[PDB]
Amino acid sequence: AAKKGSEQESVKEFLAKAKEEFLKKWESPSQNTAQLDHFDRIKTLGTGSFGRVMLVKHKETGNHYAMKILDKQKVVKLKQIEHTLNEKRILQAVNFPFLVKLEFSFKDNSNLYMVMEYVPGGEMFSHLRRIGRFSEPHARFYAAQIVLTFEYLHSLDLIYRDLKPENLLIDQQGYIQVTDFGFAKRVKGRTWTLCGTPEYLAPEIILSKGYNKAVDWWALGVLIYEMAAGYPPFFADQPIQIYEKIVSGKVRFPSHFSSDLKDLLRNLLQVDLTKRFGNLKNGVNDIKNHKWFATTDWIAIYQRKVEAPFIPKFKGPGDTSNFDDYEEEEIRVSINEKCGKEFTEF
Amino acid sequence: TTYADFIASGRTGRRNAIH
Ligand SMILES: Nc1nccc2c(S(=O)(=O)N3CCCNCC3)cccc12
């Protein structure tokens, strides 16, 4: 894990070029690259606290996209202005195989719109709950993609802060696309915001300490555990009871977890920051070189040359069968501009 | 079983973020 050989130098070089490209877009973000009547709205794919994600068809190309719609007034009431500006500025600047691609963004009097590649296979959440749990090789396949994605994001000074199966979509090749950058943030120091999802929060978030990218590696431990067990390592009907479990320093593993898997998770689900994998001198390479990943060909994963555990069923273009049904609400655009100054840079 | 306890819990659906 400490060895710095030719493979490590190639990673370094790749990330250096990736950062040069990211920073150009970070400093000069794209804006106002479509408008609402460029799209036919088809069906709601999911909802959130600010609005909905809708399947749409782009009229001029016939391509299908997922359009995230945020109500500006609701964003303001939830004190999510800066987070939403982070989300869009980061998403329009990144480029990685396992990150959803933002194709267009724009705003109108009422709403913000982010139009992303449509990922038709549905949420990992749906497949995981239905099948119960994933085998260790299948969990490994997905985990490897997150490891590489966090290596990429963290090298750009980005923290992701909301890893969970609900935010991981499965594409038509069986690979992951991360979505929901609502809490993603570019930061070189520590930061302090209480955000995330209860089951996935690191102890230092719960305890109101300054924290850094190590919270993402804790959340990877939660994700791997949930994929392989079928339930997360800390759960209870009341969030306060979840928090008490997280900070206790105790974790238990299913009988079927391999010895290697338990070892990796003890090192990711480490309350002590000075011991947590991903946060040590060797950084991500303590994870990438762990015995549980010994079979993982990191380059083959990046190149999408590894056979996936399953290919989602696909009935045709624009099919939504891998998604739940949601109540549809009509998109209303007010005749008066709302919150223009707050969202001027979007 | 812990599985059975999870499936009977109120936390098996999509989980909202906090802030
Ligand atoms: N590119 C996309 N293609 C399909 C679905 C997409 C979704 S979504 O409705 O599946 N979505 C909504 C609920 C919040 N959690 C994230 C999942 C969200 C964002 C982008 C998507």
Offer a quick outline of the entry.
Chain B: This is cAMP-dependent protein kinase inhibitor alpha. The complex is a heterodimer of chains A (346) and B (19). With 346 residues, chain A is α+β, with helices and mostly antiparallel strands.
Note the overall shape of chain B.
Answer: elongated
Q: What kind of sheet is the major sheet of chain B?
A: none
Proportion of helical residues of chain A:
25-40%
Overall structural domain count of chain A = 2
Spatial extent as radius of gyration of chain A: 20 Å
Structural class of chain A: alpha+beta
Tell me how many strands of chain A there are.
Answer: 9
Strand order, sheet with most strands of chain A = 1-2-3-5-4
Site (Important for inhibition) (chain B): 11, 14-15
Protein name (chain B): cAMP-dependent protein kinase inhibitor alpha
Family (chain B): Belongs to the PKI family.
Function (chain B): Extremely potent competitive inhibitor of cAMP-dependent protein kinase activity, this protein interacts with the catalytic subunit of the enzyme after the cAMP-induced dissociation of its regulatory chains.
Describe the structure using short key phrases.
heterodimer; A: about 350 residues; alpha+beta; 11 helices; about 35% helix; globular; B: about 20 residues; mainly alpha; 1 helix; binds 5-(1,4-diazepan-1-ylsulfonyl)isoquinolin-1-amine
